[PDB]
């Protein structure tokens, strides 16, 4: 999955990082890796994964890390909300309730 | 997946922890993360995952941890059984046989 | 999945290594392990996985590793491109853009 490098950076995603993609439109859930893109606002699903989505679909991109007890206690997740143009609306360091 | 914080605590689930959800009604199996809820007895599936379940479905929520040999020998799993209202019926520290 | 040992070596795949197979023809995505093959250009899907592919299908074979921050900064992925006969066309140490 090619993600606008600036958007990826804000979400602390590194190139090659495995991420889980869940499609809100069709319910598909799959894993792939991040490719940093040079096109502003671009999110392009490549390869076999292209069959799991349709252009225009709304998706949630999740990145997980293996952490120990101390890391969990000090951890602050980076949650980025974007608009229809993939422009940043919000970036929080805590889950919503 | 939003889980009643008190129920989550009893199962030693931390907010943000990846868990596997398996639906007994429809057989769907998927992975998502825990969101601590403030509503008593509430278990709400959010986002794309909502398409994998129906309200009223019976599910099994599994949490795994990466352990070494010594940790495995000393490990005691926290198994929580609940009723139809998600009220605690039992909590054991060993598998059933 | 049995992979020509020479091809596997070029992609730094060790026997027994878990890999993710994604089929471009049918969109199937599954995980299995590597078996080193002695037949030149051979890629044979064995067991239950055989039902997820058809002979002749184009697939992408992915290998992931768990890395820390320092390892990520120094990491160079081994990306191998092959032709229709599974002969090596290219081997790069960086992602395409």
């Amino acid at each position: 999955i090619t993600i606008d490098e600036d958007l990826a950076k804000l979400a602390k995603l590194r190139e090659g990082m495995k991420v889980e993609i869940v499609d809100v439109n069709n319910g598909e859930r799959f894993s792939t890796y991040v490719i940093l893109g040079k096109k502003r606002g671009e999110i392009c699903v490549n390869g076999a994964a292209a069959r799991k989505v349709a252009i225009g679909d709304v998706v949630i991109i999740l990145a997980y890390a293996s952490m120990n007890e101390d890391e969990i206690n000090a951890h602050k997740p980076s949650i980025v909300l974007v608009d229809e143009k993939n422009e940043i609306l919000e970036k929080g360091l805590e889950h919503h309730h | 997946i939003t889980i009643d914080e008190d129920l989550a605590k009893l199962a030693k689930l931390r907010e943000g922890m990846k868990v596997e959800i398996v639906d007994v009604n429809n057989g769907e199996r998927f992975s998502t993360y825990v969101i601590l809820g403030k509503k008593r007895g509430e278990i709400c599936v959010n986002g794309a995952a909502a398409r994998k379940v129906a309200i009223g479905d019976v599910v099994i929520i599994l949490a795994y941890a990466s352990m070494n040999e010594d940790e495995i020998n000393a490990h005691k799993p926290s198994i929580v059984l609940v009723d139809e209202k998600n009220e605690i019926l039992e909590k054991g520290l060993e598998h059933h046989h | 999945i049995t992979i020509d040992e020479d091809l596997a070596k070029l992609a730094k795949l060790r026997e027994g290594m878990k890999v993710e197979i994604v089929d471009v023809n049918n969109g199937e995505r599954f995980s299995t392990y590597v078996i080193l093959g002695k037949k030149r250009g051979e890629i044979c899907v064995n067991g239950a996985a055989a039902r997820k592919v058809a002979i002749g299908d184009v697939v992408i074979i992915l290998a992931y590793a768990s890395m820390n921050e320092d390892e990520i900064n120094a990491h160079k992925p081994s990306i191998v491109l092959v032709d229709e006969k599974n002969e090596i066309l290219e081997k790069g140490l960086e992602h395409h853009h």
Partner: peptide
């Protein structure tokens, strides 16, 4: 002992393109 934890996420982004035969 370690656990997989949500590190970061991009919520409700829009797929702008798809390339089945993407090369490299």
């Amino acid at each position: 002992m370690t656990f997989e934890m949500l590190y970061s996420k991009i919520h409700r982004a829009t797929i702008t393109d798809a390339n089945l035969n993407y090369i490299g």
